């Protein structure tokens, strides 16, 4: 009974991060020890004519990005663990997330390490127009 959500290539990393005190540090350390990034994300097909904003209601990739389903790029959603936000809710689940093509091999690691500018809506260091 039931429907699978995961593939065996992700079992080790998800188990490690599901038990960690600090899941983000565990994922960073797993990668630094030679582990593969989490796969089986929700990658979208789009027109690559979007606004390029980081977190959007519909896919908004520009020609320098890819669009993904938001929950699938969130380590806390992927491991089914608590979110660090004060009220414990997610800012990615229920939205699409734009990720620079140069980083699209590891969308989960990208979202853990980067920050969205609250003024222009683009990733700091990857589109932010506020200097």
């Amino acid at each position: 009974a039931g429907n699978a959500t995961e593939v065996p290539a992700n079992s080790t990393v998800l188990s490690f991060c599901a038990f960690a005190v600090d899941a983000a540090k565990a994922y960073k350390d797993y990668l630094a020890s030679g582990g593969q990034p989490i796969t089986n994300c929700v990658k979208m097909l789009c027109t690559h004519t979007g606004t390029g904003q980081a977190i959007t209601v519909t896919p908004e990739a520009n020609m320098d990005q890819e669009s993904f389903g938001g929950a699938s790029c969130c380590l806390y959603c992927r491991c089914h663990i608590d979110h660090p936000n004060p009220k414990g809710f997610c800012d990615l689940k229920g939205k699409y997330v734009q990720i620079p093509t140069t980083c699209a091999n590891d969308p989960v690691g990208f979202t853990l390490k980067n920050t969205v500018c609250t003024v222009c809506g683009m990733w700091k260091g990857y589109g932010c127009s506020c200097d």
Binding site: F19, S33, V42
Partner: protein, 285 residues
Amino acid sequence: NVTGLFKDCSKVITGLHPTQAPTHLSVDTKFKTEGLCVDIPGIPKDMTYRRLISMMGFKMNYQVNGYPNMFITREEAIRHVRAWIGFDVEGCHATREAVGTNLPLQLGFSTGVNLVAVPTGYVDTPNNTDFSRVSAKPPPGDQFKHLIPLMYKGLPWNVVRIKIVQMLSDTLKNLSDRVVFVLWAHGFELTSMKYFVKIGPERTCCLCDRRATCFSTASDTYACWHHSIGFDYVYNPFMIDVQQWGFTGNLQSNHDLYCQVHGNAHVASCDAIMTRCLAVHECFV
């Protein structure tokens, strides 16, 4: 190629919207085309779902610098025989809103302690994972009848994990700097450990210079077995599965080859006592 880890146990016929699905596998077929997914104008997100996600199938085979191995060899376990705590869990099954996973019900230890938990699972929602009470029933059959009264005597998990840490600390503080859980067919015991174990690099006690065996979510602090009052998680435990040592039948038949003082009283603690007793007879007698 799929795994049962994080299997969605809901009875919802359809998959999830692309923005809400944790994975490509979990996206509904309606959004899948040309090898990936599409957003479809006019198709809403689901804002009221509760999907039970299974914790059966963890794999602790990573090798990460500075993080100790959880599962240890028979030789390492023998050196730490004073840290051995037999551990067994009897589960109940998800029912009604979900089916297909086992939830911890009676947690038993070689100290003779049995702790009963409210049936609790990991329910994905549109905003988070809700660790919450779920509908459950004991497995049917006469061998499981004793679990029936336990369905209404459970304690919330926040109380159970504090009691586990206190019991382990009271037992081991003058015996070892660690715990080695002694298991027989470890899968469900490892699933149960998700509810009360955390891992990370080796740390020391907040209140003294000893190795940390406990963690507190209240303060993000670490304690040894002597200063862990009020601590809620077991930190960096070790474990070994005795069944992997070449035995062929059930636990009781192998235990009974060397021991006659532990009659089976059909309870999690008795299975935990038999498991540690079998390991001790195999390694030291």
